[PDB]
Write a protein that binds this ligand. Sequence first.
Ligand code: MG
Ligand code: MG
Lengths: 421, 421
Amino acid sequence: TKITGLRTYDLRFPTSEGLDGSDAMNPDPDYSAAYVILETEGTHEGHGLTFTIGRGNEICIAAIKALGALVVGLDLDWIREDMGRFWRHVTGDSQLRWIGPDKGAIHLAAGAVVNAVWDLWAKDTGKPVWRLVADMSPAEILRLIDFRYLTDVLAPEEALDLLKAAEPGKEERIARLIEEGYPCYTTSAGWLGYSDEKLRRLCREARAAGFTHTKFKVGRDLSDDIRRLTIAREELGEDMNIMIDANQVWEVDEAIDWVNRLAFARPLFIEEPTSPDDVLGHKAIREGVAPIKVATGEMCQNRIMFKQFIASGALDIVQIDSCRMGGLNEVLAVMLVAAKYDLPVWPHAGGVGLCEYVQHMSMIDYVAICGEKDSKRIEYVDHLHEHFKHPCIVTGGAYQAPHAPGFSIEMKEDTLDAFLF
Amino acid sequence: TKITGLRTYDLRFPTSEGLDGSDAMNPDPDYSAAYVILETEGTHEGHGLTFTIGRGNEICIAAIKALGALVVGLDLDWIREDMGRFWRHVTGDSQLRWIGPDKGAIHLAAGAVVNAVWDLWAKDTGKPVWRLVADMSPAEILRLIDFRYLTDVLAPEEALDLLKAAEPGKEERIARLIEEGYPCYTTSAGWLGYSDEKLRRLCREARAAGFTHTKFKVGRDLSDDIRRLTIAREELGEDMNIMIDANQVWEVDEAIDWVNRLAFARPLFIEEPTSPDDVLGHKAIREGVAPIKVATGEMCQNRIMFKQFIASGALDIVQIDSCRMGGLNEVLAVMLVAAKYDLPVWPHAGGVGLCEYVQHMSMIDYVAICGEKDSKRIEYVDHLHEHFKHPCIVTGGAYQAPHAPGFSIEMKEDTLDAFLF
Ligand SMILES: [Mg+2]
Ligand SMILES: [Mg+2]
């Protein structure tokens, strides 16, 4: 099997029409996918995307096309033999690196391309991605990862030790996953643009559905946030776990003051209180708002930044995103760093196809990395699942384990035509 | 004056013919400019560029075009009235922020567009950019900067104190700059691909010309580094200051061992010993290679990363780049942070037009911010200056102060035709 070509689609969805996804930083996102198909001579094609919120999607498309020169002509077997080597290769064009390195449009594109390869690999072997990786031995999983710029915090030997320690319980955990699924929380009642009445209704829906955890956007107006969280608590009840997300908007001192003003709502954590680059900033905020925890990561650019967030104790909750960084391989590296420091990973899913991706990622984390899921929650949003051949399935507050071969990301063909920008 | 339109040029120079620019990370760079011209109804046009090394330049072009939607239609007086407001505006489209924020292709593009505006402003008033800014009162300079995500280390109040404190000595320093220029160092003898014979000749030329500081690329092969540096010391003499640049290639532990092995050559600093995102890693390397200094910054993505590098004491020498970040305004922000921590700024100039840019920026630093230049060195390389209408002028180891209106970046019309990719 050889990758023989690739096609790209600039897909944009009119989510702003109802302000779905609206938050303190992004008032009117148009959920969009920079979508890629890796062509083969065979029966399978590798589908992948990276997620943006409208304008700028075409910049990612440009970056995907550039990466295409590194991938077209490759043999899939060469890729599979040492995917860490492939990852170094695909992120290793020094000229393309200059556009990053491993950040912004070029790394968003890498996420799409890398995840497309996983889709292809999984389809070829007849396994959902979570199972494809979970079935691997510790050494085989270790081999997936490019450890460059990680070794001062997590060297391959220590990663291998973690993988070996988690190996003996894998079968039981797989069975448990089939029986129970993986618990998730909802942000769908929480978008900042919603009226209070809509907020009330969607809070009742979330509770009725069996979620134990619900997230709300905050950060534009303090008076609004106090009012909204008071109302949320009324509808949700005292037992509900509430979280809040500021989407990066605050300064450090502002953030500490503002979430302390929201302390009455008993939020489990504040998400992205400030810039996603500000490690020392998050750490200062963390100290100032304890016992309210601090979460961040959905825009954390790469493993180098994540390792510093984690090693410096700048956060309580690690929120990887499936295609912000260099796809599954880099996510797995971060999950191992998180496991070394006993920090939970709660993936971001606020976007088109993101749920479809991160379900597999946490399920790998559960089976083969940290071995625990009960105390964690994958993000979930109830938007745009209708465009996927195999959408995630959530009920009673949990993702059902994927069954179809691939990465759950392939879109219905009609969608590829209807939503072309 | 109104910005009425925009043109972009994908310009690529065949620098890989002689391996000019070659280093341990980038073995065959093709010096390129994602070049932009801002159109007006008047006699002036604002020229700017961001620098890349070949493939991927087109991603920057796409990002520049995207930012064009934020800039075309703007009145120049609205911009000048509060350029910090304008800076927030051009980097503030939440959807374009998703592609960054303030990093990668979108921010490189911001650098080109922001600096192009500076070029236009300077042309309109008839001054080189450095003097346009140096003639500003402390409050007017403060007004240029967007402090978002800086206030936990440098708030506007403290930045103003710094600016006010530098104010009385401005007239003297301007005089002194006109008399003396601004000292610079050369990297033109140090490219990794050069033969030993050529290394020797270039070292002799650098020494004759009166440079007191010369930089060499290292990091590909230890034996080569040992031999080349032995040769360099031999040709340059004992009074010469030698620096070395690894272009990010090492792990932390590897960097410490490798530069310590080169200690015999007495390097003033090691530049970019590791990933440009690794603040804690640079700090660890700095401890391990003492007394050899640590420099980094040419790819430091923005003020938020620079702020952490500086405040945490991860580096000795701050190497801003003129168009890696959001152009002049963000560079000035970082210079003020550096002034607070009394760290010197030695700008990167390894690329087409970079010398032309950074000469202005360090001269602003000297006259209006930190008030000291004798102990600092702006990078210089002698490549591609023949393409500029007003190239930098270097003699006796110092940049002559620009005197023609603009940012020195405008290229000759024939270059715009001949080097289109
Ligand atoms: Mg979030
Ligand atoms: Mg350098």
